[PDB]
Design a protein around this ligand. Structure first.
Ligand SMILES: *[C@@H]1O[C@H](CO)[C@@H](O[C@@H]2O[C@H](CO)[C@@H](O[C@@H]3O[C@H](CO)[C@@H](O)[C@H](O)[C@@H]3O)[C@H](O)[C@H]2NC(C)=O)[C@H](O)[C@H]1NC(C)=O
Ligand SMILES: *[C@@H]1O[C@H](CO)[C@@H](O[C@@H]2O[C@H](CO)[C@@H](O[C@@H]3O[C@H](CO)[C@@H](O)[C@H](O)[C@@H]3O)[C@H](O)[C@H]2NC(C)=O)[C@H](O)[C@H]1NC(C)=O
Ligand SMILES: *[C@@H]1O[C@H](CO)[C@@H](O[C@@H]2O[C@H](CO)[C@@H](O[C@@H]3O[C@H](CO)[C@@H](O)[C@H](O)[C@@H]3O)[C@H](O)[C@H]2NC(C)=O)[C@H](O)[C@H]1NC(C)=O
Ligand SMILES: *[C@@H]1O[C@H](CO[C@@H]2O[C@@H](C)[C@@H](O)[C@@H](O)[C@@H]2O)[C@@H](O[C@@H]2O[C@H](CO)[C@@H](O)[C@H](O)[C@H]2NC(C)=O)[C@H](O)[C@H]1NC(C)=O
Ligand SMILES: *[C@@H]1O[C@H](CO[C@@H]2O[C@@H](C)[C@@H](O)[C@@H](O)[C@@H]2O)[C@@H](O[C@@H]2O[C@H](CO)[C@@H](O)[C@H](O)[C@H]2NC(C)=O)[C@H](O)[C@H]1NC(C)=O
Ligand SMILES: *[C@@H]1O[C@H](CO[C@@H]2O[C@@H](C)[C@@H](O)[C@@H](O)[C@@H]2O)[C@@H](O[C@@H]2O[C@H](CO)[C@@H](O)[C@H](O)[C@H]2NC(C)=O)[C@H](O)[C@H]1NC(C)=O
Ligand SMILES: *[C@@H]1O[C@H](CO)[C@@H](O[C@@H]2O[C@H](CO)[C@@H](O)[C@H](O)[C@H]2NC(C)=O)[C@H](O)[C@H]1NC(C)=O
Ligand SMILES: *[C@@H]1O[C@H](CO)[C@@H](O[C@@H]2O[C@H](CO)[C@@H](O)[C@H](O)[C@H]2NC(C)=O)[C@H](O)[C@H]1NC(C)=O
Ligand SMILES: *[C@@H]1O[C@H](CO)[C@@H](O[C@@H]2O[C@H](CO)[C@@H](O)[C@H](O)[C@H]2NC(C)=O)[C@H](O)[C@H]1NC(C)=O
Ligand SMILES: *[C@@H]1O[C@H](CO)[C@@H](O[C@@H]2O[C@H](CO)[C@@H](O)[C@H](O)[C@H]2NC(C)=O)[C@H](O)[C@H]1NC(C)=O
Ligand SMILES: *[C@@H]1O[C@H](CO)[C@@H](O)[C@H](O)[C@H]1NC(C)=O
Ligand SMILES: *[C@@H]1O[C@H](CO)[C@@H](O)[C@H](O)[C@H]1NC(C)=O
Ligand SMILES: *[C@@H]1O[C@H](CO)[C@@H](O)[C@H](O)[C@H]1NC(C)=O
Ligand SMILES: *[C@@H]1O[C@H](CO)[C@@H](O)[C@H](O)[C@H]1NC(C)=O
Ligand SMILES: *[C@@H]1O[C@H](CO)[C@@H](O)[C@H](O)[C@H]1NC(C)=O
Lengths: 203, 323, 203, 323, 203, 323
C-alpha cells in the first residue's frame, strides 16, 4: 500500500539527519535545519519493538527430540516416523517464511504512512501561507525567526498573528497594481463633491 | 525560508526480500536465524555427558571386557556413540527388544550397580568358573562378560536349579540374563548332560518358559553356537524366581535406576570440552536467543526451532534511498 | 496502516451520536446536528459480517478424539502418538492467534479509510466554499437552511445556485477588522460618506 | 454554520490486542473461545452412556461378580471408567491384547449376550461345577466369572475333549476362553491326571496349538498358578472348533455386535445426569457454536476445536476514544 | 484500506483503452485521448509477476505416497496413520485458502493505490491551473496543443511559460460581471447613485 | 480541454472471492487448481508398469498357476493390483508378515529369477514328483506352485535332510519356503512316517526351529490341513542352511533384487496405454504446472500437492466495472 511519499514525490533521503527517522530542515536567515522530531518517531520505534517481541513470543522452544531405532521388521513404523517428521518440518518452515514476508510489506507501508501523516499535519496548520512547492517545501510569505519555526515544530502557529502581512504579501505579490496606481477612475475627484453635498445637507 | 520535511538515510547495505520485490536495501534490520556453532560438546548444566567411545550400548550393559575403561560410570547428561562403537555382543546371538531397552534408557539419569548373586556364595552345586570361550577373547586370554555368569555341570552330576530374589531398594531394578544353546546334541550333553532342559522366569507380570533348540548353522567368529538375551524391569516389592535346568546364563549384576528425564543417544564424533550451555547438537553447542535454528534437527535441551531455509532477515526501518 | 483520520486530525469521539458509526453535525439557523449516514455505514456492516462469517467457515469441527493405551513394550509407539498430538495442537494454536491479530489490524484500518473517504467526498462536493478549518469543520459563505444540509447529505449541492452570492461574500471578507473598521485606499468611509450623502439626499 | 464530521463513540471498555499495540479498547467486539461447562455427563442424542463404577472393562467382559450390577447392560452411547475402576481379572494371569480389544469396542454400540454352550447340556463327560477358587470369592463363597466355565476331571477319568460351534446370526460374534496352568506337576495331575496336555482352536483365520507350562513362581492372591485369556472375532457363516485335553476355560456366553462408531473410554468422575448435548468432555458437556474450545482435548462427538490459549477477542468496530 | 478512487470519486472504467491499465484521455483542439501510460503500469506488471512467481515457489512438490496395509490386529497403528493423513490434509487446505484470500485483498488495494498516486502526481505538477472538477477532470486556463499534453504525460510542464496568460485568464474567469464593473468594489454601480444625490442637491 | 484520468476495463466475467466480498468480477486472473486428467495409465519416464490382473501379489510370487501368464515379468515401474485381484494362496493357510513383505517390495525395481535347488539333481533321496493337491487344480489337472516344491518320502523311507545354499551374487537375495501340516496323526504318518518332526532354518540373523501341529478343524476348499509361509532376505557373503525332517516346502526359485526407490501398489481398474508422464493417480495421469492438485491424494511421481477445495482463483487485475 504505497502511499506515495517514500521515493514518491519526495525523492531522496537525508544523510545529514542523525537522530530520528523523520525531520525538519528550517532555512531562515541564520543557519539551516536538520532537526529531528523526537515525538512521532518514538511511537514508530515503540510499535516496531512491540512487533518484533510479539513475533519472538509466539514461537516456542522444541525439547529433546532424539532419533529412534528399529529392526528390519518395523519398516512400516519407521516410514511412518519419517513421514511425520518431514511433514511437520515443512509446515513450520512454510509458516516462518510467509510470516516474515507479510510483516516486511506491512512495516514498510507503516513508515510510508508516518511520513505522509507528518506532511499532512505540517500542511494543516499553515493554511494559505508558504505556497507549497516541489517535494515538500514551503515558502513563508511572512518572515519569522527560529521561534516561529520552533512553534511550527511544536504544531502551534497562532495563524491570525501572521495573516494580514502575509496576506498583504500575497496581496503585493499578486496585486493588479496598474488599476490603482495611486489615482484613477475619476472616483476620487467626483466623490469629494458628494461629501460636500452631505456637509451642506448636514449643516 | 523553507521548512522542507524529510527522513533519515544511511550507508546501510543489507537487503531484505519483501513479496513485491527482491533485494530491498533497508536502514536497520535484525537477523532471526542461527548458523554459528562450536565444534565442541559441552556439559549440560555442569554434568559431563557419558561417552561410550568404541562401545555399543548392549556391549556396555552386558560388559564386554573390550569396554573395560568405562566400567564405573554412573551418571551423565546424555549418551554419546561414535561410528566405531562396534564391540557389542562378542558371542553371537540375539538381543531381543534392544530398541525398547534403548528407549527406557532415554528417561533414566543415573545408576547404582551391585551384585545380585555373589559368584562365590550363592552356587554350592555347580562348576562356576570353567566355562569361557575364545570367541570373546581379550588380550590373549579367553574372556567373558563382566555382568553375567556362564554355568556348567559339576563333573557328570547336575542338580536342578531354582533361585529367587526380592526387591527391597525402592527404585526400579533392571535384570538381564541369557540362554545358551549349542548347535549339536552331543555337545548339549557334553556341557549339560540333559537330553531335554528348560528354564523359567516368573515375577508377577512376567512369566516365560524357555526351551533351547539345537541345530547346525554356519559359524560366526569361530562359533556355531548361539545365545539369546532377555531383560526385565522390577519394582519395589515384587520378587523374581529363576527355575533353571540346563541352559542359563546367570545374572551377576543389576541396576538400581533413577528418574531424571530427557536423555539421548546422539551418535556423533566431535570431541568433548568443558563449557556449559543449554543446547546441544551433534554438530556442537548453541548459544543465542534467536528462535530459529538451521544447523541440525536432532537436539538435546531447550533449543531454538529447526527450519530448512537460509535467510530470514526482518526489516525494521526505511528503504535506504540516497540522493 | 493508519491513514491519519481517527485520533489524527479528528481528535475526539461522539458519544451523542447513536445510530450509525459515521455522522455529521450541522449548526444551521435552528438546532444542532448529530445525524447518521445510514448509507456508507451499511457497507462496513456487510463487510465486517462477511469477514467474521468467512473466518468461522474456514475453521472446522473436530469429531471424537479418544486417548489410547499401550502396554510396557510399546513405548516407542506411545511417544510417537504423543509427538503427533503435541505437534498438531501447537500448529493450530499458532494459526489461530496469528489469524486473529492480522484481522484486527485490517479492520481498524478499514474504519480509518472509510472515515477519510467520507471526509473527501464532503470536501469534493464543496469546491470554493466554507473554507475548511480545524478538525474538518466548515463555514458556508452563503447562508442556508436544513434543506442544503439534507442536500449535501444526499450528495447533492447544486453549486451554481449558491456560487455567485457566496463568491461575492468571499471577496468582501477581508478588511473590516485590520483597522477595526477596515483598510482601504482613501474611500473606506469616504464612500461611506457618499452613502450618507445618498441618505441625506433621500430622507 | 459547520458540518463537522465525527465518528461514533461509546462507554464500552473491552480491549482487543493488535500487533502494534496491546490493550486497545474497541466499541464492539466478539469472543470466539469457550470456557464454561456444566460438570455434568449427559446423553448423546437420547441414549444414555454406560457408567462402569468400580469395574474394569476386562472384569466386565469376564463378568467379575464384583461387577454383577451391570449384568443386563446391553446398549450405550459411550463408556465411562472411573478412577476407582479396579476389578479386572480376579484370578492372576494375563489378558492378552487388552488394548486391541478396547479399540475394537470403540466402534460397537449394542449387544445380545447369549449362551454359547448351555451349562447342563454340552458337557456330559466331565464334572461341571466342583472346580471354583476362593480367590474370586463372593461374600466369602468360592465364586467365578459368569461368562466362562472352569472344567475339572470326572472321578479319576478324563475324556479327550472336542466341541464345535457355528455362527448363523448374520453379525460378528465375539468369543472368549482361557487356559489354566498350575505351578506344580502334583497339582497338574491332581487337577487333570494327564502329564501332557494341549488345547487347539481353529476356525478359518485363527489357528493355534496351546500347551501349558508348569513352573514355580511367587503366588499372588494365594495362587501360584496362572491363567491366560484369549479372544477372537467370528464371521457370519464361518464356524469354530475347540479340541482340548486338559487345560480349558470354556466359554459360557458370547456377544452379538452392532455398529455405530464414535464411542470411547473417557474416564472421569463428574456425575451423571440426563440432558442431551452434542459434545462431551471429562469435565462436562459443551453448548455453543464458537469455533474454538479450551476446556479439554479429549472430546466425544461434534465438538468445537481444541486449542491452548486464553483470550481470542476479535475487534468489530472502532477505537472507543472519548474526549 | 480502500482508498476510494476506483468506484469512488472516479466512477467507471474505460473500455476504449486497450494497451495498459492506467491512462489518460485528453480532449484538446484536435483529436481525443485514450492514450496509455506505459511507464507506471510496467511497475505494476513486474510486481504482480514477482508476487505470483513467489507464491508458486513457496509451495513444494510432494513425492510418491502410497497407502499401506494392515492385518486385523494392528488397528491402533491404522487409526494412527489415518489421523496423521487427515491432519496434514486439513492443515494444507487451511493454509491454501487463507493465503489466496489475503493476497486478493492486498492486490486490489495495490491497484487502487496506483490509481490514486497517479492522480496525485498529475495534480501536483499543475499548481493553480485548470480548476479541477469531479472525477479527475480539468480545464486548462491556457490553451495548448498536443505538445503540452505529451509534455505533462512525460512529467514536464514548465509552469512559468504559461503562468501569466493563465493568470489573466483565470482572473477574467474570476471576473463574472467584474469585466463590466471595475471600480475596485461595487463602485461602478455605486458611482451612479451619488450622482442622483448631487443632482437632487443642486436640483 | 482536459486530461481526465482512468483505468482499463474488460468484458470478462471470471469471479474472484475476497475476504470482505464474495463474487468480485475481476479483469484478469490466473488459475491455481487442477482437475483435468485422462482416464489412462501411462508409463512412467519411459519405463512400463506392471499389471497383475486377477492376482494377489502373494499368489504371484509363489506362482499360483492361475497367475501363469505374467511368468516372464522382471521389470516394472509400479505394481497395479485390480479390484478382481483375488488369486492369492490356493492351498489354505497363512502368509506371515505379508504387509512387511509388501513394503519391502515398495523399493525394488527389477528381478533376476533363477533356480535355487535344481529339481532333477538336488534330491537323491526322496520322491519329489508324487506330491500335489487337487485343491490347487489347473484346467482340471491337480497342480501346485511354481517356485516351491512339495516333498514326499521315497517308499516308507526318509533320510534326514540337510542342505545349505550360499550367496555369491552381490545383490540381496529373497528366499521363500513353507511348512505343511495335516489335521490327523494318521495322515502325518501316512506322508512322513514320523511321530514328531521338525525343521530348522538358520543363516546368521534369522534362526528358528519349526514344529508342526495336528488338530482337527473345519476344512476349506476340501482341505482340512494348513500350510504356513516364510521368507527371508539374504546378503552377499552370508549363507543359509535348511535342515528338515517332516514338513518342508522346498524353495525352487529365488530373486535377485535391484534398488531405485518409489514403487507403488496402486489399485485401480482404468486401462493401460503407452504415453509417458511424470505423475500418476488411480483416477488417471496428470500434466500440469499449477501447484495444487485436487483429483486424488495417492500419487506417484513429482506431483503437486493434494488439497480438498473447489475454487482457488487468484486475481491479477482490477475490479472490472462498466459504466
Ligand atoms: C571389538 O571390536 C573390534 C573392531 O571390530 C574387533 O576387532 C576385529 O575383530 C574381528 C574378529 O577377529 C577381525 O576380523 C577378522 O580378522 C582376522 C584377523 O585380523 C581375519 O583373519 C578375518 O578374516 C577377519 O578379517 C577384525 O580384523 C578386528 N579388527 C580390529 C581393528 O581389531 C574385536 O574383535 C571386538 N572384540 C570382540 C571381543 O569381539
Ligand atoms: C475388587 O476391587 C477391590 C478394590 O479394587 C478389591 O478389594 C481389595 O482386594 C485386595 C485383595 O483382593 C485386598 O488386599 C488385601 O487385603 C487383606 C485384608 O485387608 C490384607 O491382609 C492384604 O495385605 C491386602 O491388602 C484389599 O484389602 C481390598 N480392598 C478393599 C477396599 O476391599 C477386590 O479384591 C476386588 N475383587 C476381586 C474379586 O478381586
Ligand atoms: C483363482 O481365482 C478364481 C476367482 O477369484 C477362483 O475361482 C473361484 O474359486 C472358488 C473356490 O473354489 C469357487 O467357489 C466355489 O465354487 C464351486 C464351483 O463353482 C462351488 O461348488 C462352491 O460352492 C463355491 O462357489 C468359485 O466358484 C470360483 N469362481 C468362479 C467364477 O467359478 C479360483 O479358484 C482361483 N484359483 C485357485 C487355484 O484357487
Ligand atoms: C538478489 O540478491 C542476491 C544477493 O546478491 C546481492 O544483491 C544484488 C542485488 C547485488 O547487489 C549483488 O551484488 C549482491 O551480492 C543475488 O544472488 C547472488 O547473485 C550473484 C550474481 O549477481 C551470484 O553470483 C550469487 O551466487 C547469488 N547468491 C545467491 C545466494 O543466490 C540475486 O541474484 C539477487 N536477485 C535479484 C533479482 O536482484
Ligand atoms: C492490559 O490490560 C490488562 C488489564 O488491565 C486493564 O486494562 C488496562 C488497559 C487498564 O485500563 C487497566 O486499568 C485495567 O485494569 C493487564 O492485565 C493485568 O495487568 C497486571 C499489570 O498491569 C498484571 O499484574 C496482571 O497479571 C495482568 N493480568 C492479565 C490476565 O493479563 C495487562 O497487563 C495490560 N497490558 C500489558 C502490556 O501489561
Ligand atoms: C457467488 O456466485 C456463486 C456462483 O453462482 C453464480 O454467480 C452468482 C453471482 C449468480 O449470478 C448465480 O446465478 C451464478 O450461478 C453462487 O453459488 C451458487 O449460488 C446459487 C444461488 O445461491 C446456488 O443455487 C448454488 O448451489 C451455488 N453453488 C456454489 C457451488 O456456490 C453464490 O451463491 C454467490 N454468492 C456467494 C455469497 O458466494
Ligand atoms: C513550542 O515552541 C514554541 C516556540 O518557541 C514555544 O513557545 C515559546 O517558548 C519559549 C521558551 O524559551 C518562551 O520563552 C516563549 O515565551 C514561548 N512563546 C512564544 C515565542 O510565543 C513553546 O514553549 C514550545 N512548546 C509548546 C508545548 O508549545
Ligand atoms: C436528498 O436530498 C434532496 C435535497 O435535500 C432531496 O430533494 C428534495 O426532495 C424533497 C422531497 O419532497 C422535495 O420536496 C424538494 O423539492 C427536493 N429539492 C430540494 C430541497 O432542492 C431528495 O429528495 C433527497 N433524496 C434523494 C433520494 O435524492
Ligand atoms: C515528452 O513530451 C515533451 C513535449 O510534449 C517532449 O519534449 C519535446 O519533444 C519534441 C518531440 O518529441 C522534441 O522535438 C523537442 O525537442 C522536445 N523538447 C523541448 C520542446 O524542449 C519530450 O521529449 C518527451 N519526452 C520526455 C522523456 O520528456
Ligand atoms: C503435457 O503438457 C505439455 C504442456 O502443457 C505439452 O507440451 C506441449 O505440446 C504441444 C504439442 O507439441 C506444443 O505445441 C506445446 O508447445 C508444448 N508445450 C510445452 C510447454 O512444451 C505436452 O504435449 C503434454 N503431454 C505430454 C504427454 O507430455
Ligand atoms: C557509514 O558512515 C558512518 C558515519 O558515521 C560510519 O560510522 C559507518 O561505519 C559507515 N558504514 C560503513 C559500512 O562503514
Ligand atoms: C553465550 O552467549 C552469551 C550472550 O550471548 C555470552 O555472554 C557468553 O559468553 C556465551 N558463552 C557461554 C559459554 O556462555
Ligand atoms: C453505557 O451506556 C449505556 C447507555 O444505554 C448503558 O446501558 C450502559 O450500562 C453503560 N455502560 C456502563 C459500563 O455503565
Ligand atoms: C444450549 O444453548 C442454547 C443457546 O444458548 C439453548 O437454546 C439451549 O437450550 C441449550 N441447551 C441445549 C440442551 O441445547
Ligand atoms: C470480449 O471482447 C474481446 C475483445 O477484445 C473479445 O475478444 C472477446 O471475445 C469478448 N468476450 C467474449 C466472452 O466473447
Amino acid at each position: 500500500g504505497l502511499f506515495g511519499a517514500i521515493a514518491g514525490f519526495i525523492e531522496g533521503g537525508w544523510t545529514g539527519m542523525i537522530d530520528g527517522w523523520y525531520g525538519y530542515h528550517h532555512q531562515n536567515e541564520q543557519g539551516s535545519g536538520y532537526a529531528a522530531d523526537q515525538k512521532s518517531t518514538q511511537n514508530a520505534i515503540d510499535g516496531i519493538t512491540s512487533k518484533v517481541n510479539s513475533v519472538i513470543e509466539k514461537m516456542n522452544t522444541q525439547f529433546t527430540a532424539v532419533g529412534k531405532e528399529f529392526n528390519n521388521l518395523e519398516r512400516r513404523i519407521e516410514n511412518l516416523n519419517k513421514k511425520v517428521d518431514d511433514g511437520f518440518l515443512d509446515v513450520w518452515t512454510y509458516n516462518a517464511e510467509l510470516l516474515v514476508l507479510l510483516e516486511n510489506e506491512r512495516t514498510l507501508d507503516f513508515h510510508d504512512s508516518n511520513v505522509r501523516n507528518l506532511y499532512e499535519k505540517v500542511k494543516s496548520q499553515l493554511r494559505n501561507n508558504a505556497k507549497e512547492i516541489g517535494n515538500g517545501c514551503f515558502e513563508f510569505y511572512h518572515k519569522c525567526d527560529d521561534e516561529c519555526m520552533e512553534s511550527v515544530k511544536n504544531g502551534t502557529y497562532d495563524y491570525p498573528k501572521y495573516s494580514e502581512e502575509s496576506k498583504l504579501n500575497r496581496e503585493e505579490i499578486d496585486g493588479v497594481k496598474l488599476e490603482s496606481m495611486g489615482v484613477y477612475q475619476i472616483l476620487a475627484i467626483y466623490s469629494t463633491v458628494a461629501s460636500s453635498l452631505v456637509l451642506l445637507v448636514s449643516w | 525560508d523553507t521548512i522542507c520535511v524529510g527522513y533519515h538515510a544511511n550507508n546501510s547495505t543489507d537487503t531484505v526480500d519483501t513479496v513485491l520485490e527482491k533485494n530491498v536495501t533497508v536502514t536497520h534490520s535484525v537477523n532471526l536465524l542461527e548458523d554459528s556453532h562450536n565444534g565442541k560438546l559441552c556439559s549440560l548444566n555442569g554434568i559431563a555427558p557419558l561417552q561410550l567411545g568404541k562401545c555399543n550400548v548392549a556391549g556396555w550393559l552386558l560388559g564386554n571386557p573390550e569396554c573395560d575403561l568405562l566400567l564405573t560410570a554412573n551418571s551423565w547428561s546424555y549418551i554419546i556413540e561414535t561410528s566405531n562403537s562396534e564391540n557389542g555382543t562378542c558371542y553371537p546371538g540375539e538381543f531381543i527388544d534392544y530398541e525398547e531397552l534403548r528407549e527406557q534408557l532415554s528417561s533414566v539419569s543415573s545408576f547404582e550397580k551391585f551384585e545380585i548373586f555373589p559368584k562365590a556364595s550363592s552356587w554350592p552345586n555347580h562348576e562356576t568358573t570353567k566355562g569361557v570361550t575364545a570367541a570373546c577373547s581379550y588380550s590373549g586370554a579367553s574372556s567373558f562378560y563382566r555382568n553375567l555368569l556362564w554355568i556348567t555341570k559339576k563333573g557328570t552330576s547336575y542338580p536342578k536349579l531354582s533361585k529367587s530374589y526380592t526387591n527391597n531398594k525402592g527404585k526400579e531394578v533392571l535384570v538381564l540374563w541369557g540362554v545358551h544353546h549349542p548347535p549339536s546334541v552331543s555337545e548339549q550333553q557334553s556341557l549339560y548332560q540333559n537330553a531335554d532342559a528348560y528354564v523359567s522366569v516368573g515375577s508377577s507380570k512376567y512369566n516365560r518358559r524357555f526351551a533351547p533348540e539345537i541345530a547346525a548353522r554356519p559359524k560366526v567368529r569361530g562359533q556355531a553356537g548361539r545365545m539369546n538375551y532377555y531383560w526385565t524391569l522390577l519394582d519395589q516389592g515384587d520378587t523374581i524366581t529363576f527355575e533353571a535346568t540346563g541352559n542359563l546364563i546367570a545374572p551377576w549384576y543389576a541396576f538400581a535406576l533413577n528418574k531424571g528425564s530427557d536423555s539421548g543417544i546422539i551418535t556423533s564424533d566431535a570431541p568433548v570440552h568443558n563449557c556449559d550451555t543449554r543446547c546441544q547438537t551433534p554438530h556442537g553447542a548453541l548459544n543465542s536467543s534467536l528462535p530459529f535454528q538451521n544447523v541440525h534437527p536432532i537436539t538435546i535441551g531447550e533449543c531454538p526451532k529447526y527450519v530448512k531455509s537460509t535467510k530470514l532477515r526482518m526489516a525494521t526501518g526505511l528503504r535506504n534511498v540516497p540522493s
